[PDB]
Design a protein around this ligand. Sequence first.
Ligand SMILES: C[C@@H](c1cccc2c(-c3cncc(O)c3)c(C(=O)O)[nH]c12)N1C[C@]2(C[C@@H](CN)C2)OC1=O
Ligand SMILES: [Zn+2]
Ligand SMILES: [Zn+2]
Length: 232
Amino acid sequence: SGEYPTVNEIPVGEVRLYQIADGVWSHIATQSFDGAVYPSNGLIVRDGDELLLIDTAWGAKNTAALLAEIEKQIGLPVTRAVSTHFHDDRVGGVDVLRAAGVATYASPSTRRLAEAEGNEIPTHSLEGLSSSGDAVRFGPVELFYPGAAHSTDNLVVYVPSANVLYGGCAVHELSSTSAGNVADADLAEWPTSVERIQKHYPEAEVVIPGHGLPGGLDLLQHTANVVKAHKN
Ligand SMILES: C[C@@H](c1cccc2c(-c3cncc(O)c3)c(C(=O)O)[nH]c12)N1C[C@]2(C[C@@H](CN)C2)OC1=O
Ligand SMILES: [Zn+2]
Ligand SMILES: [Zn+2]
């Protein structure tokens, strides 16, 4: 009833949307992994009379439910999707999208990693993102490669019309006590990558993590802090 939806509030298989700003929503879904349940976020950005999707809803059935929820709540067609790294919370559901008419995109690095590890593979490669600090425009967003953090391929997304920074899994929520799933992370480079985000997007008003509650710019410093302490 208006609060940001949380893990125990979303059964696995259902999806909820949350209005972030004019023409910007997050999507929230839940999934089981190694016997625990987790929430995860993505983004939806209005692109005229179409929608740009950022990240899947962590699985094929969740992603079908996402498309249904978008049709219910927004009623504009999703035409393109970008996955912000190669893990299943970002690409699981790409096959569903691709069969529903959505053109799917990711960096070449993400595509290679997804292929190598047996995850679903976005169709189209996003060039111009291979060096830290690179940025490219993609419809109503800017895509930015900050350097290795949660993963070596992680991208962040900025919505300039609304000053919304979607950090994906490179950014943690304020309640986080740990650096999350660090299996593929670079804990040594992560603070430097966060510093690049902080420098590039000083006017961000909302910061959205890959999992958990949005907040303001403090999510970036908090992330750097928890990562440094995890490493320590
Ligand atoms: C699908 C994703 C994943 C699964 C389960 C939980 C998380 C979390 C997470 C968030 N918050 C708190 C927390 O405890 C955990 C994140 C997060 O941090 O981005 N990601 C999660 N994968 C799986 C994998 C691939 C590797 C294969 N060897 C393991 O590394 C990942 O990042
Ligand atoms: Zn991940
Ligand atoms: Zn994640």
